[PDB]
Write an enzyme that holds these catalytic residues in place. Structure first.
Site: not given
Ligand SMILES: [Mg+2]
Lengths: 244, 250, 240, 215, 222, 231, 235, 233
Positions: E1-2, H107, H1-2
């Site tokens: 997850q980022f 994000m 989110t990637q």
């Protein structure tokens, strides 16, 4: 721009009157007369259909008298199409109240809300007002039998006996003459018909040109019944009072 | 940019008249004659097909329209206004009834919904009223056969028989003499053709006349078999040939 | 949304829509407010061209905003219901956030602010209504009487009248009301209020409404017979 | 995430407010000189427990709302109304993650000395004695046993000072210094900063307490 | 997850004198065990005799400083070129930080300057906006190493007067700018020895009524 | 006549009367002068007062360290447009780390004023602006009109009796353009230029307003005793 | 009809010019600025004797260091005052300081032209804004519905403004004391007022650095009225 | 989110006396698969800037489009677009850095690490880094990914501080970069032999070198290595 074509429906005259409301009332004065009379043991609603044609289907017709719920009804005077918009709103409001409190809506609360909607169209939105006057006939456990009227201004008042539409001046004088407080429903039925018979613009008052309804406690023990009269039932009540 | 017309274009005049509605009715008066007659076992609606040009194919332009399998409609006045009303009427029958109750609406309620649409064009911002009067014939289980008229104001009235448009005054008088409560459907069709001949001037045949009925169920027009309760549409548009057959014994 | 500026200035510096709203108030039935030493009394006219009325159910002219504050008015009846509703909501909202009922001055300031907002908002006309707001502040025994009008200006009054023929009844009050010594009792205050309405009304039968407000949420409306006694007493003293 | 000891109690002469001064980030002592009493205005005080930023920001914001109230109403705001403005505000943010535990203290005519415990999950309690923080238990013990309504101002100030000292001693996340306040009807009065290091030895000798500690 | 946050290391230090104030910070920028830059300044002159540093996550630090510099610019426009006092700047920064209470700037912020009486002032902020004025404040990676040393040498904590039975404390007093810089240099050389994220260089910004002066000193590069 | 009710209407001869009426508001405004050399650019403005008890209306507004303008007409409209310029200058600095070109500043003002002249409901801006600045291509002077038309010039003047100062600058063109590396002499030329638009009144200490920007000079405004040198 | 935000051929906004006519009908308000303070005074003008004059609120506090007097359609001023109070308190919250009097006035004047087809019409009220700050000291501003504001040493607005302004031209000097200014407002108010001036139909106020903005009592003003009459009879 | 799919590895760069050098290999990896071999990851902007990008290739192509559109937009109503008001490296960098930080704050990042190398109008060398987090820093040598761990140490032996920049020639600097690219080919599992190199000089301008190969490699000693300990054969 579009300013050029705006009639400005919600403004005051120099004399402090609302142009569109006054002109809507003028429209209503040409509509078929509707009478409401409140008795000690019930309420009568009588209304004259607008110049009937012989090929009009009379039995499956509804122009003047509408049912709002089991305990409340209205007589209409003005544009029928406008009235039906307001009637469906009133029917919905009554059900919202029942859903919320598990009790049938008090008559005045329904009348106030419907009258507040009319008021809104005179103060904001730039739209024409509803060209409709109502007579509300209903019952609740607080005030018992009640008669109200509302008009395009959104102002409402309570009555013992009242007329709307055409020839209200003449009709109100006749009601004021023969009405008394200890009156019964059967007597009120007779008064309503006699008044229309004298104020009508027609040659003679007949069953096919009338709509009639009562709200009695004539059902079995402490409960209210709404009776929207059939054509044959109007024919009989007209003979019984000696008009035809 | 944007629609700045948020105000009413129809307003009360000092005399109490709603000008735009009156003028809309005047447009209906100019329109071609259409009529409707109710029988004991059915209803008939009819109108003249006023062709704009002989090169035009009058079959492509349908003045009589199916709204539901048991309800039909005809008009007098402005054709384009009628066409869009039929589109809206068909859709509202589904969205505000069939998708809720799983069955088609009864005639009186569909008429009520169409009337609502026409009333809103009389009060809403930046719009004129519809320039048409409708005649809506239909059938439903609990009310039986019925015929309604709908005006630009949004007002609607039930009729035993009536006419609207160009020669409506004379046509209504003709129908008063001929109508009775014991009329069979075939008798009503016969009277409809007699009444319409008076108002029509040019050619009078199955190609210049448009006529439909609300009568018995038509299993052959259903398109499928296997479900006993589904018996087929009561609305049927009479063909050009079927009209000409009745014009011989006239 | 409908945006039109209906209330605007004219060359001479007047806002005609606000001034025409005052004409609607001048057409309305007369309403009077008189405050005594320990009370306030609100008197109201009811026109007698309407017989066959049902007085049980007909909307009363004086309205309770809270248990300790009342509001009467002159002008358009339908318009008044909107101001009364907003005022009632604000009264309960004040109790909820401040944990104390509204003062009469605060409630007046709110209603007057609503009236003002409708004089410079697009797509709306001013309220054709002037109000008399009266009552007693929480835990206070000093009587309060305020007036509002369509423009949105408000002010406090020892005694005041609004509506049709209000200039006549204001003339009466201006000489009959003493600042140094106001009506000491309830009876004296009610009598002066009835007297002032009798200059204009016509008959003292079912035409006059009287509502008395006292400290600590003590509000009561007088009946026909009770009011008729004041009418009978004043007329006998007049013949002199 | 702030260890603290804050108290406030009603008595004959008004309100006493007392707090510690320590701020910790885990075991690391970030500050010993933190102001945990927020001077909302000359008449109202607020305590800081839980989120430092949340308490500072919103009790300063509260003082702005109180100033606007008295400008419009030409009257001092009640402690009830001031506390409710703050509690209604944090209730709107409920679930978002605000962290507060505060006592809103004031002295007015209609109410008298009044204390409201206001908390980030929406609680609003009126009361006579409140203690909040990691060291609240230690301070409650001294308060409960020695508290009386008819305390003098001198004795009440000492009680609040002694109660914080009790917590500063035992609670690892409480200490630094003690800040005292006395709230009267005419406004609050600051009664100085007291280093706990010097205060402990002083109280030990003069009082005879803390025999467990060699000095 | 980022993960939207990072740690760029570094440490900063603000001390306040009688008629001056210093704001120091190392010039090393890091990620994990790598060195990104040996000279990347993170103490800035923001105008109106205010110096500022936001240590921690560099991206958030640069954004905050950039926003405050911009806040100063608009204060002049809107308020007739009025000088922004250090106390007013502090309150303004609280509102910048708390504006992102639910997605914070991961930075420890310190500003230095002179108050309205001409005396030295230092303010320190937590990541979400709580602030306090202080004589002495270290921030960042090696704050835990430096701060107790300052307590001992600046505020003379735990030091008692010789012969007085530990009854008489050593008296508080203002230090000279020369004595302060000595403590700063010794603070950072000590932190450089024992903290891996500290080193390369030391840049100090001194603030007096005359203006803002700079001083640079090399640090160990290991 | 019938075609001046709003800005959305063209006249039969193709004129926009509401825009022309907005232009008229500038002519009623107090005089202001702009001129530049190769190194510096100068604004000179005659301030106006309500009476002797009142202050003098400020005519010059700073937009950035390297740019600013003087106004003539509706002052609130100048505040709106100057605020917009401040934001655009600022957007250029934060996003691109770039000082906004004086030419682009003009293009942005033109496009903002234009939108108000083509839509119903709104109105044209009722003010004229003289923008000066120093960017990567040297000194600049612009003239903004609320029709949308922006023009780059060596010198100009707008407001009441602005024709006198405009004629003077047209004569003096060759002289003042070469005043390089000398601020005080360029101002003197501007003060002498605005003096050609004076009637009955003369330049006093709290009446005159001067602003300058250049190579090694940030945009700064001079008022009060600071302009006593040039009287 | 015609647009709300329309220009006249002379280059003025019709609605703004018409609102100025409404302000001329309003009651008189006077302000005088000195080195010892700023004085604000107004004509109450009760429409009837039964109206309780103390409820007439034409002088208003914005903050402790800023006061305000109004003239014209006074109902329109309520939202202007509300905005001013919010602007003043909001600035204190953001910057932990008092807000400059000029900046406060500018904030109020930004509302002025936010009308069209935003509110439906301009404000029909003019404001005298008086205050003190550390930078520019004691100040008096005149805020119009045009969005324009001028600073003044002394200023009168309302029905008797042109007559009162001419009187202020002669009387004002840079060395006026606070007491002298108080009497000067009362003197000029008594000259332009229709009814006879007393403590009930006129109101005084001031703003000083030390005590902040204060509205005077009817008892305090009454003594200043009595002091004024005696001094004029003394020569 | 990637999550990044097709990726580019190290980008390396350094300053020298008259300008800057930047380099990056021509590979687009798909996890462990070396899927695409003709990928250009150095993108010139004008004749004075080169942007070197690593990380997600789809996000790189997006940035290419932004930069291309930036040049177009700058030319609008700009007579000095090829002169005084041309795009500078500092302008191009700040724009990207603004975008990268805005995207991380929503994000939804651009999964890249970027180095903007160029020469300013006054002759000053520009070299600055920005990544998916919006983090920025400048140094005499800059590198991304593995280059940070292996290249920087080699390039810092040449230019260890600011004072070493005037002493470093273009011949020496280019030699160090080419040597670094060889080391990355030895030791980075997601690297390729083919690469591009760009030089921006204040005198000779922009020199863009394509289709370079790592050469002069040492592999011969591998023949002597047998087993993993005891094995002799
Ligand atoms: Mg190392």
């Amino acid at each position: 721009g579009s300013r050029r074509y705006d009639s400005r429906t919600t403004i005051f005259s120099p004399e402090g009157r609302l142009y569109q409301v006054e002109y809507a009332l003028e429209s209503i004065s040409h509509a078929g007369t509707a009478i409401g009379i409140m008795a000690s043991d019930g309420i009568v609603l009588a209304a004259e259909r607008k110049v009937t044609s012989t090929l009009l289907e009379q039995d499956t017709s509804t122009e003047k008298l509408y049912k709002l719920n089991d305990k409340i009804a209205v007589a209409v005077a003005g544009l029928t199409a406008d009235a039906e918009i307001l009637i469906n709103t009133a029917r919905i409001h009554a059900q919202n109240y029942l859903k919320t409190y598990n009790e049938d809506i008090p008559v005045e609360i329904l009348v106030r809300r419907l009258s507040d909607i009319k008021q809104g169209y005179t103060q904001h939105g730039g739209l024409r007002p509803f060209g409709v006057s109502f007579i509300y006939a209903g019952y609740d456990d607080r005030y018992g039998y009640q008669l109200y009227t509302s008009n395009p201004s959104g102002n409402y008042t309570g009555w013992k006996a009242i007329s709307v539409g055409a020839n209200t001046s003449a009709a109100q004088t006749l009601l004021q003459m023969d009405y008394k407080d200890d009156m019964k429903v059967d007597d009120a039925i007779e008064l309503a018909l006699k008044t229309l018979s004298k104020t009508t613009d027609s040659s003679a008052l007949t069953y096919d040109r009338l709509e009639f309804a009562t709200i009695r406690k004539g059902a079995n023990d402490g409960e209210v019944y709404q009776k929207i009269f059939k054509p044959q039932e109007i024919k009989d009540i007209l003979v019984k009072t000696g008009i035809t | 940019m944007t629609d700045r017309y948020s105000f009413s274009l129809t307003t009360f005049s000092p005399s109490g008249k709603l000008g735009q509605i009156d003028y809309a009715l005047t447009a209906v008066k100019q329109g071609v004659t259409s009529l409707g007659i109710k029988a004991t076992n059915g209803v008939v609606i009819a109108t003249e097909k006023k062709s704009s040009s002989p090169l035009a194919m009058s079959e492509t332009l349908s003045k009589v329209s199916l709204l539901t399998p048991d309800i039909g409609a005809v008009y007098s006045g402005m054709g384009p206004d009628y066409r869009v009303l039929v589109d809206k009427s068909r859709k509202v029958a589904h969205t505000s009834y069939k998708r809720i109750y799983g069955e088609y609406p009864p005639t009186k309620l569909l008429v009520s919904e169409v009337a609502k649409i026409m009333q809103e064009a009389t009060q809403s911002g930046g719009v004129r009223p519809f320039g048409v009067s409708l005649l809506i014939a239909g059938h439903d289980e609990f009310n039986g056969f019925s015929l309604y008229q709908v005006d630009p104001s949004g007002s609607y009235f039930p009729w035993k028989a009536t006419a609207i448009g160009k020669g409506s005054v004379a046509a209504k008088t003709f129908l008063e003499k001929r109508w009775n409560d014991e009329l069979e459907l075939e008798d009503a069709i016969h009277i409809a053709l007699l009444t319409l001949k008076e108002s029509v001037e040019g050619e009078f045949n199955g190609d210049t006349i448009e006529l439909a009925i609300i009568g018995d169920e038509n299993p052959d027009l259903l398109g499928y078999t296997g479900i006993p309760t589904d018996k087929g549409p009561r609305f049927r548009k009479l063909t050009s040939q079927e009209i000409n057959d009745r014009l011989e014994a006239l | 949304g409908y945006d039109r500026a209906l209330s605007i200035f004219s060359p001479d510096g007047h806002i005609f829509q606000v001034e025409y709203a005052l004409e609607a108030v001048k057409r309305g039935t007369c309403a009077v407010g008189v405050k005594g030493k320990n009370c306030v009394v609100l008197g109201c006219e009811r026109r007698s061209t309407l017989k066959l009325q049902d007085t049980r159910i007909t909307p009363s002219k004086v309205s309770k905003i809270d248990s300790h504050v009342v509001l009467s008015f002159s002008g358009l009846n339908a318009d008044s219901r909107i101001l009364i509703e907003k005022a009632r909501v604000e009264a309960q909202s004040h109790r909820l956030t401040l944990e104390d009922p509204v003062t009469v001055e605060y409630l007046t300031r709110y209603v007057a602010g609503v009236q003002q907002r409708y004089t410079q908002s697009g797509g709306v006309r001013p309220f054709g209504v002037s109000t008399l707001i009266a009552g007693f502040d929480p835990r206070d025994d000093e009587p309060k009487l305020y007036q509002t009008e369509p423009s949105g200006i408000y002010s406090s009054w020892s005694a005041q009248t609004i509506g049709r023929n209000s200039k006549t009844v204001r003339e009466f009050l201006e000489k009959n009301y003493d600042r140094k010594e106001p009506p000491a009792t309830v009876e004296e205050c009610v009598k002066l209020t009835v007297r002032s309405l009798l200059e204009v009304v016509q008959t003292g039968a079912k035409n006059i409404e009287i509502t008395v407000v006292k400290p600590d949420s003590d509000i009561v409306a007088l009946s026909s017979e009770e009011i008729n006694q004041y009418v009978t007493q004043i007329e006998q003293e007049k013949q002199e | 995430a702030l260890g603290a000891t804050t108290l406030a109690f009603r008595f004959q002469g008004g309100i006493i407010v007392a707090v510690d001064s320590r701020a910790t980030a885990g075991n690391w002592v970030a500050s010993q000189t933190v102001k945990k009493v927020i001077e909302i205005n000359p008449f109202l005080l607020g305590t800081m427990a839980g989120g430092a930023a949340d308490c500072q920001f919103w009790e300063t914001w509260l003082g702005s709302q109180c100033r606007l109230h008295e400008l419009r109403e030409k009257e001092r705001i009640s402690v009830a109304a001031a506390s409710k403005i703050l509690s209604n505000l944090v209730y709107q943010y409920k679930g978002a993650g605000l962290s507060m535990g505060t006592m809103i203290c004031g002295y007015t005519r209609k109410e008298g000395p009044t204390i409201y415990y206001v908390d980030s999950d929406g609680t609003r309690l009126k009361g006579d004695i409140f203690c909040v923080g990691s060291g609240q238990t230690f301070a409650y013990g001294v308060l409960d046993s020695n508290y009386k309504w008819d305390l003098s101002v001198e004795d009440a100030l000492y009680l609040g000072k002694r109660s914080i000292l009790a917590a500063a001693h035992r609670d690892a996340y409480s200490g630094g210094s003690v800040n005292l306040y006395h709230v009267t009807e005419d406004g609050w009065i600051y009664h100085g900063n007291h280093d706990v290091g010097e205060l402990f030895w002083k109280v030990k000798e003069e009082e005879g307490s803390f025999n467990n500690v060699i000095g | 997850q980022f993960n939207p946050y990072g740690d760029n290391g570094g440490t900063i230090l603000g001390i306040a004198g009688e008629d001056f104030a210093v704001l120091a910070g190392d010039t090393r920028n890091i990620t994990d065990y790598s060195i990104n830059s040996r000279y990347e300044p993170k103490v800035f002159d923001c105008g109106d005799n205010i110096v500022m540093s936001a240590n921690g996550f560099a991206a958030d630090g640069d954004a905050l400083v950039k926003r405050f510099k911009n806040s100063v610019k608009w204060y002049h426009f809107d308020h007739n070129d009025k000088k922004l006092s250090i106390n007013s700047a502090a309150r303004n920064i609280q509102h910048l930080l708390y504006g992102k209470r639910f997605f914070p700037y991961y930075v420890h912020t310190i500003i230095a300057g002179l108050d309205e009486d001409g005396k030295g002032a230092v303010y320190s902020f937590d990541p979400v906006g709580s602030y306090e004025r202080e004589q002495c404040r270290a921030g960042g990676a090696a704050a835990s190493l430096i701060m107790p040393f300052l307590d001992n040498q600046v505020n003379f904590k735990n030091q008692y007067e010789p012969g007085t039975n530990g009854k008489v404390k050593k008296p508080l007093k203002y230090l000279s700018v020369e004595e302060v810089i000595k403590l700063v240099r010794d603070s950072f050389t000590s932190a450089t020895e024992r903290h891996i994220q500290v080193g390369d260089g030391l840049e100090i910004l001194i603030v007096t009524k005359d203006g803002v002066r700079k001083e640079f000193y090399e640090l160990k590069r290991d | 006549n019938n075609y001046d009710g709003d800005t959305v209407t063209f006249s039969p001869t193709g004129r926009l009367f509401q825009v022309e009426y907005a232009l008229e508001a500038i002519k009623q405004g107090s005089v202001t002068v702009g001129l530049r050399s190769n190194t510096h650019a100068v604004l000179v403005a005659l301030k106006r007062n309500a009476d002797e008890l009142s202050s003098y209306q400020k005519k010059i507004i700073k937009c950035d360290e390297h740019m600013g303008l003087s106004l003539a007409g509706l002052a609130p409209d100048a505040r709106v447009l100057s605020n917009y310029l401040r934001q655009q200058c600022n957007y250029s600095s934060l996003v691109f780390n770039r000082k906004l070109a004086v030419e682009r500043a003009g293009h942005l003002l033109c496009d903002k004023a234009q939108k108000n002249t083509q839509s119903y409901g709104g109105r044209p801006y009722g003010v004229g602006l003289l923008i000066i600045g120093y960017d990567k291509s040297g000194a600049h002077l612009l003239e903004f009109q609320p029709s949308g038309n922006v023009t780059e010039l060596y010198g100009t003047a707008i407001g009441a009796r602005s024709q006198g100062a405009k004629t003077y600058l047209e004569r003096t063109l060759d002289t003042f353009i070469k005043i390089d590396g000398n601020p005080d002499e360029l101002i003197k030329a501007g003060v002498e230029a605005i003096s050609q638009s004076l009637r009955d009144e003369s330049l006093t200490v709290d009446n005159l307003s001067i602003a300058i920007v250049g190579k090694d000079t940030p945009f700064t405004i001079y008022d009060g005793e600071a302009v006593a040198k040039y009287i | 009809d015609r647009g709300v935000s329309t220009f006249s051929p002379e280059g003025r906004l019709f609605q703004v010019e018409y609102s100025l006519e409404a302000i001329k009908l309003g009651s008189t308000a006077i302000g005088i600025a000195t080195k010892e303070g700023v004085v604000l005074g107004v004509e109450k003008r009760a429409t009837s004797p039964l109206l309780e004059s103390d409820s007439i609120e034409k002088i208003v506090e914005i903050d402790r260091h800023i006061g305000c007097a109004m003239s014209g359609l006074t109902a329109d001023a309520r939202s202007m005052i509300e905005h001013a109070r919010t602007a003043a308190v909001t600035h204190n919250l953001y910057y932990d300081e008092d807000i400059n009097v000029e900046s406060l006035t500018q904030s109020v004047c930004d509302l002025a032209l936010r009308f069209g087809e935003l509110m439906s019409r301009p404000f029909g009220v003019a404001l005298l804004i008086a205050g003190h700050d550390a930078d520019d000291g004691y100040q008096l501003f005149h805020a119009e519905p045009s969005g324009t504001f001028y600073r003044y040493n002394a200023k009168a607005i309302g029905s008797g403004s042109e007559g009162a302004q001419a009187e202020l031209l002669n009387e004002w000097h840079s060395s006026l004391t606070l007491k002298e200014a108080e009497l000067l407002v009362l003197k000029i108010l008594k000259q332009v007022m229709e009814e006879k001036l007393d403590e009930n139909n006129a109101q005084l106020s001031c703003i000083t650095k030390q005590d902040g903005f204060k509205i005077y009592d009817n008892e305090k003003t009454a003594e200043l009225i009595k002091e004024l009459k005696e001094k004029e009879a003394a020569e | 989110t990637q999550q990044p799919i097709v990726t580019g590895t190290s980008v390396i760069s350094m300053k020298y006396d008259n300008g800057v050098i930047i380099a990056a290999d021509n590979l687009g990896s798909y996890g462990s698969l070396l899927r695409f071999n003709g990928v250009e990851r150095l993108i010139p902007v004008g004749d004075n800037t080169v942007v070197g990008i690593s990380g997600d290739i789809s996000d790189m192509q997006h940035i290419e489009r932004l930069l291309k559109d930036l040049v177009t937009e700058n030319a609008y109503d700009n007579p000095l677009a090829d002169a005084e008001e041309a795009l500078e490296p500092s302008y191009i960098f700040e724009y990207l850095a603004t975008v990268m930080y805005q995207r991380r704050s929503k994000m939804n990042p651009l999964w890249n690490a970027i180095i903007v190398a160029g020469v300013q109008s006054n002759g000053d060398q520009f070299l600055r880094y920005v990544n998916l987090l919006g983090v920025t820093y400048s140094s005499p040598t800059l590198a991304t990914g593995f280059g940070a761990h292996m290249a920087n140490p080699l390039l810092r032996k040449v230019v260890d501080r600011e004072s070493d920049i005037p002493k470093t020639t273009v011949q020496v600097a280019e030699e160090a970069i080419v040597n670094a690219m060889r080391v990355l080919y030895y030791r980075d599992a997601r690297s390729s032999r083919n690469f591009s190199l760009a030089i921006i000089d204040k005198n000779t301008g922009l020199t863009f070198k394509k289709n370079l190969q790592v050469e002069n490699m040492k592999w011969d000693f591998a023949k002597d290595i047998k087993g993993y300990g005891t094995q002799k054969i």
